[PDB]
Design a protein around this motif. Structure first.
Motif, mmCIF file in Angstrom:
data_model
loop_
_atom_site.group_PDB
_atom_site.id
_atom_site.type_symbol
_atom_site.label_atom_id
_atom_site.label_comp_id
_atom_site.label_asym_id
_atom_site.label_seq_id
_atom_site.Cartn_x
_atom_site.Cartn_y
_atom_site.Cartn_z
ATOM 1 N N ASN A 1 -1.686 17.960 15.453
ATOM 2 C CA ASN A 1 -0.258 17.684 15.521
ATOM 3 C C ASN A 1 0.090 17.657 17.013
ATOM 4 O O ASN A 1 -0.800 17.728 17.887
ATOM 5 C CB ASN A 1 0.594 18.679 14.711
ATOM 6 N N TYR A 2 1.365 17.492 17.307
ATOM 7 C CA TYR A 2 1.857 17.444 18.662
ATOM 8 C C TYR A 2 2.498 18.790 18.960
ATOM 9 O O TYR A 2 3.181 19.353 18.104
ATOM 10 C CB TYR A 2 2.881 16.329 18.826
ATOM 11 N N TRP A 3 2.266 19.283 20.178
ATOM 12 C CA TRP A 3 2.866 20.461 20.778
ATOM 13 C C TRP A 3 3.712 19.989 21.942
ATOM 14 O O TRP A 3 3.698 18.795 22.311
ATOM 15 C CB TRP A 3 1.801 21.453 21.271
ATOM 16 N N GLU A 4 4.464 20.931 22.519
ATOM 17 C CA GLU A 4 5.399 20.581 23.582
ATOM 18 C C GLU A 4 4.878 21.032 24.936
ATOM 19 O O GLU A 4 4.657 22.228 25.141
ATOM 20 C CB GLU A 4 6.775 21.190 23.369
ATOM 21 N N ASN A 5 4.657 20.076 25.844
ATOM 22 C CA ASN A 5 4.485 20.369 27.264
ATOM 23 C C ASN A 5 5.874 20.425 27.921
ATOM 24 O O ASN A 5 6.339 21.507 28.293
ATOM 25 C CB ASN A 5 3.528 19.363 27.900
ATOM 26 N N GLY A 6 6.576 19.287 28.003
ATOM 27 C CA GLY A 6 8.018 19.301 28.104
ATOM 28 C C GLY A 6 8.533 18.304 29.127
ATOM 29 O O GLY A 6 7.842 17.386 29.556
ATOM 30 N N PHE A 7 9.794 18.465 29.484
ATOM 31 C CA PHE A 7 10.379 17.657 30.549
ATOM 32 C C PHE A 7 9.845 18.115 31.886
ATOM 33 O O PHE A 7 9.773 19.317 32.165
ATOM 34 C CB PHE A 7 11.892 17.773 30.488
ATOM 35 N N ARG A 8 9.472 17.168 32.712
ATOM 36 C CA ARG A 8 8.798 17.457 33.970
ATOM 37 C C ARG A 8 9.780 17.378 35.135
ATOM 38 O O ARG A 8 10.623 16.483 35.172
ATOM 39 C CB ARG A 8 7.647 16.473 34.209
ATOM 40 N N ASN A 9 9.593 18.273 36.121
ATOM 41 C CA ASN A 9 10.460 18.401 37.288
ATOM 42 C C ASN A 9 9.666 18.346 38.584
ATOM 43 O O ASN A 9 8.522 18.799 38.655
ATOM 44 C CB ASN A 9 11.258 19.715 37.159
ATOM 45 N N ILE A 10 10.267 17.731 39.598
ATOM 46 C CA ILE A 10 9.582 17.475 40.859
ATOM 47 C C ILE A 10 9.707 18.684 41.783
ATOM 48 O O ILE A 10 10.805 19.180 42.033
ATOM 49 C CB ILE A 10 10.129 16.220 41.547
ATOM 50 N N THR A 11 8.572 19.129 42.308
ATOM 51 C CA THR A 11 8.440 20.213 43.265
ATOM 52 C C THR A 11 7.722 19.644 44.482
ATOM 53 O O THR A 11 6.888 18.746 44.344
ATOM 54 C CB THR A 11 7.674 21.349 42.603
ATOM 55 N N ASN A 12 8.077 20.108 45.682
ATOM 56 C CA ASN A 12 7.349 19.691 46.875
ATOM 57 C C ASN A 12 7.640 20.688 47.990
ATOM 58 O O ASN A 12 8.485 21.577 47.843
ATOM 59 C CB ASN A 12 7.690 18.245 47.274
ATOM 60 N N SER A 13 6.894 20.538 49.098
ATOM 61 C CA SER A 13 6.970 21.411 50.266
ATOM 62 C C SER A 13 7.403 20.688 51.538
ATOM 63 O O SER A 13 7.311 21.262 52.634
ATOM 64 C CB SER A 13 5.604 22.076 50.521
ATOM 65 N N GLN B 1 4.914 27.405 18.813
ATOM 66 C CA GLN B 1 4.722 26.790 20.115
ATOM 67 C C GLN B 1 6.032 26.257 20.668
ATOM 68 O O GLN B 1 6.349 26.432 21.852
ATOM 69 C CB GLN B 1 3.749 25.614 20.004
ATOM 70 N N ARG B 2 6.660 25.376 19.891
ATOM 71 C CA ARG B 2 7.828 24.681 20.378
ATOM 72 C C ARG B 2 8.913 25.679 20.675
ATOM 73 O O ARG B 2 9.618 25.563 21.678
ATOM 74 C CB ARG B 2 8.246 23.655 19.338
ATOM 75 N N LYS B 3 9.000 26.716 19.855
ATOM 76 C CA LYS B 3 10.012 27.734 20.072
ATOM 77 C C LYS B 3 9.725 28.517 21.336
ATOM 78 O O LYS B 3 10.634 28.793 22.119
ATOM 79 C CB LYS B 3 10.082 28.667 18.868
ATOM 80 N N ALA B 4 8.470 28.865 21.566
ATOM 81 C CA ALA B 4 8.129 29.639 22.750
ATOM 82 C C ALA B 4 8.274 28.798 24.010
ATOM 83 O O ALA B 4 8.649 29.322 25.063
ATOM 84 C CB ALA B 4 6.700 30.204 22.638
ATOM 85 N N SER B 5 7.995 27.497 23.921
ATOM 86 C CA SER B 5 8.124 26.615 25.078
ATOM 87 C C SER B 5 9.568 26.502 25.533
ATOM 88 O O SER B 5 9.860 26.522 26.743
ATOM 89 C CB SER B 5 7.572 25.224 24.732
ATOM 90 N N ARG B 6 10.484 26.387 24.582
ATOM 91 C CA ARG B 6 11.888 26.155 24.946
ATOM 92 C C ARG B 6 12.586 27.443 25.373
ATOM 93 O O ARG B 6 13.301 27.445 26.374
ATOM 94 C CB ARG B 6 12.575 25.429 23.792
ATOM 95 N N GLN B 7 12.313 28.566 24.711
ATOM 96 C CA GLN B 7 12.676 29.839 25.319
ATOM 97 C C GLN B 7 12.068 29.967 26.712
ATOM 98 O O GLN B 7 12.702 30.487 27.636
ATOM 99 C CB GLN B 7 12.210 31.003 24.442
ATOM 100 N N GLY B 8 10.830 29.500 26.879
ATOM 101 C CA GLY B 8 10.146 29.641 28.150
ATOM 102 C C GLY B 8 10.741 28.817 29.266
ATOM 103 O O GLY B 8 10.747 29.257 30.432
ATOM 104 N N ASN B 9 11.251 27.623 28.938
ATOM 105 C CA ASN B 9 11.909 26.817 29.951
ATOM 106 C C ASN B 9 13.232 27.458 30.408
ATOM 107 O O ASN B 9 13.606 27.361 31.589
ATOM 108 C CB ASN B 9 12.180 25.419 29.425
#
Ligand SMILES: C[C@H](O)[C@H](O)[C@H](O)[C@@H](O)C(=O)O
Length: 310
Positions: free
Chosen positions: A120-132, A246-254
């Motif tokens: 099945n599909y799990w959630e990695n999520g919306f991606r955000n740009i980081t840089n130095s 998974q999906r629940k832990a990912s979104r609490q995690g974000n």
């Protein structure tokens, strides 16, 4: 019909990421459903290599189970590149609806031919740009940034059209690339930014949510096919439970990730109402150019599904 079995589950993210914890949840669920006969051993943090090596281990059979981003799967099945197009899914509910519905299934159905089972599909999520290098608050700020991307024609072409110097790199190599400035920046979800500690070496974070990355929860077809029907039901029932956990832990995690990076005083920028629109016109052409390399029916089906869900 369940015989004692030891099952190896490698992955790339840190063990205390939401997905790392979901892997432990899956190991726990498999053990209960099997009377402790089926024991899943997790190897987090890139121990068994990056996504690309994990894919091949499942192909050959040296590894049994993994979760990987869709992007590396494009190297086998180009249609999976569709998820690297910016702004396909407005939010997580659109994402769930589409991936869990006919269009997500069509893609998972392409896995057995290459030696994989898409559980099945799990959630990695919306991606955000980081840089130095400098804050990124406008599209023009991307210009010439040395940005690592995932190893895919779609990802490479998207960010180069946004003006970055796009460096494909395995995730397992990222932290060192960032710390040594071999690359200026990177792009991942907040909970990964946090748990891989990229913030330690990335003073700038931009809340861009420009691409949504599904994980595919994978099993080796070679291995899965040698299982009993009872043993398969353990895997697929475990996969279903762990997906919801998974999906629940990912979104609490974000949410927790956002709190943490803010309270840790990361310099958090955002894209103006317009700068976001400035982004869309820039990509629309190269997005259009990339349809031929993904599959028109895939791109258009996914966009149609995404439109109905929202
Ligand atoms: C290997 C990980 O589990 C995942 O594929 C990765 O973090 C992905 O977002 C990436 O940036 O390459």
């Amino acid at each position: 019909d369940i015989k004692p079995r030891i099952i190896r589950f490698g992955y790339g993210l840190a063990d205390d990421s939401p997905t790392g914890k979901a892997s432990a949840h899956f190991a726990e669920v498999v053990s209960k459903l099997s009377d402790g006969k089926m024991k899943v051993k997790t190897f987090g943090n890139g121990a068994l290599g990056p996504d690309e090596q994990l894919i091949n281990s499942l192909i050959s059979g040296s590894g049994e189970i993994t979760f990987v981003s869709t992007a590396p799967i494009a190297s086998l099945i180009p249609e999976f590149g569709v998820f690297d197009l910016p702004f396909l899914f407005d939010n997580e509910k659109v994402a769930d609806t589409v991936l869990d519905g006919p269009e997500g299934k069509k893609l998972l159905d392409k896995l057995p031919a290459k030696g994989l089972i898409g559980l099945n599909y799990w959630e990695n999520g919306f991606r955000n740009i980081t840089n130095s290098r400098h804050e990124i608050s406008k599209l023009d700020d991307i210009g010439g940034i040395k940005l690592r991307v995932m190893q895919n024609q779609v990802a490479l072409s998207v960010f180069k059209g946004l003006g970055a110097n796009a460096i494909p790199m395995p995730f397992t190599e990222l932290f060192t690339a960032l710390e040594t400035k071999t690359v200026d920046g990177q792009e991942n979800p907040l909970s990964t930014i946090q748990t891989s500690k990229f913030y330690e070496v990335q003073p700038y974070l931009t809340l861009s949510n420009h691409v949504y990355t599904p994980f595919v929860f994978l099993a080796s077809k070679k291995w899965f096919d040698q299982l009993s029907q009872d043993e398969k039901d353990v895997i697929t029932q475990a996969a279903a439970d762990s997906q919801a956990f998974q999906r629940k832990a990912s979104r609490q995690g974000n949410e927790d990730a956002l709190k943490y990076l803010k309270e840790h005083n990361v310099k958090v920028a955002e894209f103006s109402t317009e700068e976001r629109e400035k982004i869309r016109e820039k990509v629309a052409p190269i997005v259009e150019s990339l349809k031929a390399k993904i599959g028109k029916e895939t791109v258009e089906g996914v966009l149609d599904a995404a439109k109905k869900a929202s």
